[PDB]
Design a protein around this ligand. Structure first.
Ligand code: HEC
Ligand code: HEC
Ligand code: HEC
Lengths: 96, 96, 96
């Protein structure tokens, strides 16, 4: 640690006094997990908005074929081929 | 691909022009994951409604024993035995 | 099973009559998964409230460094060291 930064943080540990072991365990779990969970939600919200706004959802339902194949069908075809999927989305790789 | 179906889809790739690599990565992640996530939510909503409406929740809380064992206790007993659990629910297998 | 407890439960299986195999599969999935999911939500709500109420969020954003390091940065440093993280939170282990 940078001692000057520790000097800012160390005093804030007093704010956790009186919490139970269970509370501190939950807090530690949260500290370890929240950043990835928040990032994934942010990215998925961005994706969902694009998918609806650009018109994709008009032909692609999650689990039923309509005008186009379901997203289940698409996901099956591109399982383990995300690089190729991105290339398809960019117009660089033809449809499978 | 069916060329006649490609003729419908290929033009829609123009709707993704101007999006960043990060946006396209999020979109691809979404395409790969959403169908399973949507199906699991749909199924879990169906299950939760049955569980409450049929009266199960009156005797079975998630993590505390009341009239009957907690769902944690039940899940422990049936861990790796979902086929047997379904048979129990149907009246075909006696309680453990 | 305790026969006296089976006598309470067995009759309630009549409440599942007329449900499809798919409905019963969803119900069994729910029975197997809900207790852990409910416990984890309860714990994470407790943690989130502590984190905000005690002032931690004023210096620790999820994915950007501000006054203090991001929670992503913290999680990286403490990956596989949750015991040490808890000890740090208690004032027992110095910062890394
Ligand atoms: C909005 C920009 C989108 C996105 C992200 C996708 N589509 Fe479509 N699509 C349609 C049809 C008839 C097909 C089958 C033909 C084919 O497979 O190319 C498709 C297919 C796809 C795929 C799979 C590509 C592959 O390798 O097979 C993907 C990833 C995909 N789409 C994404 C039909 C339509 C529409 C009907 C008018 C509209 C609108 C869209 N698609 C829009 C999008
Ligand atoms: C609503 C239809 C439900 C569902 C899906 C379940 N129950 Fe009960 N239950 C009760 C008691 C006292 C016991 C212990 C006796 C026993 O174990 O059989 C149970 C047990 C269960 C189990 C576990 C079965 C096993 O193998 O042990 C399962 C899967 C289960 N229940 C599901 C008591 C009650 C009630 C009190 C009046 C009511 C209502 C229900 N149960 C309803 C349901
Ligand atoms: C509210 C009680 C909290 C909790 C749970 C944490 N902090 Fe902070 N913190 C700050 C600075 C400048 C640093 C860097 C110095 C250092 O690393 O010690 C930190 C660091 C942490 C860590 C990492 C500990 C380590 O081993 O490096 C953890 C787990 C942590 N914090 C938790 C700055 C601040 C504040 C600015 C005034 C406030 C308020 C907090 N922190 C509050 C908390």
């Amino acid at each position: 640690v940078d001692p000057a930064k520790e000097a800012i943080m160390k005093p804030q540990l007093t704010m956790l006094k009186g919490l139970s072991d269970a509370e501190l365990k939950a807090l530690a779990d949260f500290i370890l997990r929240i950043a990835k969970q928040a990032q994934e939600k942010q990215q998925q919200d961005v994706a969902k908005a694009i998918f609806q706004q650009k018109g994709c959802g008009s032909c692609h339902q999650a689990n039923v074929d309509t005008v186009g194949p379901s997203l289940a069908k698409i996901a099956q075809a591109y399982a383990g081929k995300e690089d190729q999927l991105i290339k398809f989305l960019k117009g660089e790789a033809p449809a499978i």
